[PDB]
Design a protein around this ligand. Structure first.
Ligand SMILES: OC[C@H]1O[C@@](CO)(O[C@H]2O[C@H](CO)[C@@H](O)[C@H](O)[C@H]2O)[C@@H](O)[C@@H]1O
Ligand SMILES: OC[C@H]1O[C@@](CO)(O[C@H]2O[C@H](CO)[C@@H](O)[C@H](O)[C@H]2O)[C@@H](O)[C@@H]1O
Ligand SMILES: [Mg+2]
Length: 580
DNA sequence: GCGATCAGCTTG
DNA sequence: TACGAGCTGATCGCA
């Protein structure tokens, strides 16, 4: 049965009620400076469809959109908010976002459209977006009659589902998580994405030229050592050269042929000079393809800025993800790649980049949740946690901790946060499972509180069916009861890791909200540009640096109060590279 | 021809 | 290569 609605030619008072489900449709996946194809409003007076050119030109409608007292319920309000920002229109009063609500109730459902969220409450009177718009090269905006009914059905679904979703969130003790954390954060992310980050394209192009020369040199050296030319970027062709022509040892395979992963080549390095060259070729090749050419592809030709999109409703732990471009995986570990960051610069003259990061937030969160006396004391003394861990597991004094010992203790700490297992640690340190098991036993002997916590959280996941974070984020773990060892073990590691990674996510999200409130109170021009899991990157006038050096760390350290202190380091400079 | 999947890389 | 992510070149898919 078709859904009734008015296909209006002009905006009317009835369409501007103080509460409504609103749909501002942006079909392009990347909504930056993208078209709004249609608008639907459902309220107490009825259902309406409005053409964008008409509604967005209407003074009354624009005023309604920007009136905080006129409440709107939507799905993915950030998409609408940003598309509107590009048009110079402010969207205010969004009191409910169905996408974020669904995400909090169950991140595993992978809800990415209204139909998916609605199915959670047995509501199916709305079609999936893909069914209406198609996918890939066949994607397109349907004729008005089809488009209009779809937007109205989405608005109608949002109108009907708000109460049931809010009711379940309340039962889960997640009502504040949605209203005081995720929704306010959505507006902040919208501002960050819209602001964008300035790129020194001249610098990038120059780097690309130098890289091209180096790649050519290494490429030729590879063919010389191989005795022939081949596609180095072809794992299949490479495997033939390495394991057949050069007779290198086969220590691991894949599916179609031999394995040539970095971990494999690193071990084969001692056998032939060609290996080190292949690894170098791959390093430079990634910089060229992704961080030079790929980046330049998404830089806006007019402003020279990149506008990422932070997916706020994707990760299973509560973290954000970043795309087109992903600004959360810019090289930094190796100096040659780190130089890439010299291309990310302030957007205005005489401004600087300011970066603040939490020091060991995951292990500090673990100390707090596990209430481990030894771990808490370690952070209360602000000790080098990896050196401390080495001292404890190897039973030696600080002066007796060797570099190799610290390195292995650090690996143990990573394993503890990820969800420890002898195989995982053995694989990472290239040692036997038995040896790894001994390291783990020693760790738990020194941190009995952490041991109790890991045992208890797995038991809790089985009893309740899910685990939670500090601010009540939830993750269901049905595989925790599997009779298949591998499947169950993966779920157990998720039970151990999610409260840690997820609570750290909760904390920085709250820090972002608190920070923006302080920046506004102080009327600073400084603003957030990026978030990279445990760090915040801002840009501001050089004249604001001293104030930021005190303000940002304080706000981040005070976001929440734990049993141990939170510590934040910070740096600033002329480019992202220099904010070190 | 196209798009989906594999294998490699990058980050916290 | 453990936990959580995204991008790109090569290749198995077959319409
Ligand atoms: O707008 C972001 C929001 O949209 C979803 C779909 O509901 O993802 C779409 O947009 C992303 C950004 O362009 C794309 O990466 C993704 O492929 C596309 O489906 C949500 O996942 C996200 O929260
Ligand atoms: O030996 C107990 C020890 O094993 C773990 C897995 O490392 O859990 C196993 O034993 C539990 C019963 O004590 C089961 O509930 C669980 O399903 C099984 O994998 C640890 O959690 C536990 O400390
Ligand atoms: Mg850090």
């Amino acid at each position: 049965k078709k859904m009734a609605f008015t296909l209006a030619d002009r905006v009317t008072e009835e369409m501007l009620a103080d509460k409504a489900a609103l749909v501002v449709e942006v079909v392009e996946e990347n909504y930056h400076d993208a078209p709004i194809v249609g608008i639907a409003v459902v309220n107490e007076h009825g259902r309406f469809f409005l053409r964008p050119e008409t509604a967005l030109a209407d003074p009354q409608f624009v005023a309604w959109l920007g009136d905080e007292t006129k409440k709107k319920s939507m799905f993915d309000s950030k998409r609408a908010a940003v598309a509107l920002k590009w048009k110079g229109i402010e969207l205010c009063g969004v009191s409910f976002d169905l996408l974020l609500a669904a995400y909090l109730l169950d991140p595993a459902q992978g809800v990415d459209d209204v139909a998916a969220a609605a199915k959670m409450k047995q509501y199916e009177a709305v079609r999936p977006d893909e069914a209406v718009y198609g996918k890939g090269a066949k994607r397109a905006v349907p004729d008005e009659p089809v488009l209009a009914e779809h937007l109205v059905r989405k608005a109608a679904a949002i109108w009907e589902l708000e109460r049931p979703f809010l009711d379940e969130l309340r039962r889960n003790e997640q009502d504040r998580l949605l209203v005081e954390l995720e929704q306010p954060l959505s507006s902040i992310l919208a501002e960050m994405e819209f602001a964008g980050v300035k790129v020194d394209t001249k610098r990038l192009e120059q780097m690309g030229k130098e890289l091209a020369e180096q790649l050519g040199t290494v490429e030729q050296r590879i063919y010389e050592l191989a005795g022939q030319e081949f596609n180095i970027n072809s794992p299949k062709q490479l495997g033939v050269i390495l394991f057949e022509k050069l007779q290198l040892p086969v220590l691991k395979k894949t599916k179609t042929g031999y394995s040539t992963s970095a971990d494999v080549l690193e071990k084969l390095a001692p056998y032939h000079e060609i290996v080190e060259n292949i690894l170098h070729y791959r390093q430079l090749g990634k910089l060229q393809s992704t961080y030079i050419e790929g980046l330049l592809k998404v830089v806006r030709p007019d402003t020279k800025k990149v506008h990422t999109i932070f997916n706020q409703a994707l990760t299973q732990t509560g973290r954000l993800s970043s795309t087109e471009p992903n600004l959360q995986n810019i090289p930094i570990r190796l100096e040659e790649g780190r130089k890439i960051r010299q291309a990310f610069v302030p957007s205005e003259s005489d401004w600087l980049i300011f970066a603040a990061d939490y020091s060991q937030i995951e292990l500090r969160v673990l100390a707090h949740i596990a209430e481990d006396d030894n771990l808490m004391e370690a952070f209360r003394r602000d000790l080098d946690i990896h050196t401390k861990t080495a001292m404890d597991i190897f039973q030696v004094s600080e002066d007796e901790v060797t570099p190799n010992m610290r390195r292995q203790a650090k690996a143990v700490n990573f394993g503890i946060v990820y969800g420890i297992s002898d195989y995982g640690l053995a694989q990472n340190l290239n040692i036997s499972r038995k040896e790894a098991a001994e390291f783990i036993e020693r760790y738990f002997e020194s941190f009995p509180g952490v041991k109790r916590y890991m045992e208890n959280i797995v038991q809790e996941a089985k009893q309740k069916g899910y685990v939670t974070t500090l601010l009540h984020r939830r993750r269901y773990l049905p595989d925790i009861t599997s009779r298949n060892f591998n499947v169950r073990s993966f779920a157990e590691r998720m039970a151990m890791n999610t409260p840690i990674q997820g609570s750290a996510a909760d904390i920085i999200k709250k820090a972002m909200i608190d920070l923006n409130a302080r920046l506004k109170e102080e009327r600073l021009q400084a603003h957030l540009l990026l978030q990279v899991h445990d760090e915040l990157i801002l840009e501001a006038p050089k004249e604001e640096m001293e104030r930021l050096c005190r303000l940002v760390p304080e706000v981040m350290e005070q976001a929440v109060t734990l049993r141990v202190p939170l510590k934040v380091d910070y740096h600033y400079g002329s480019t992202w590279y220099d904010a070190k």
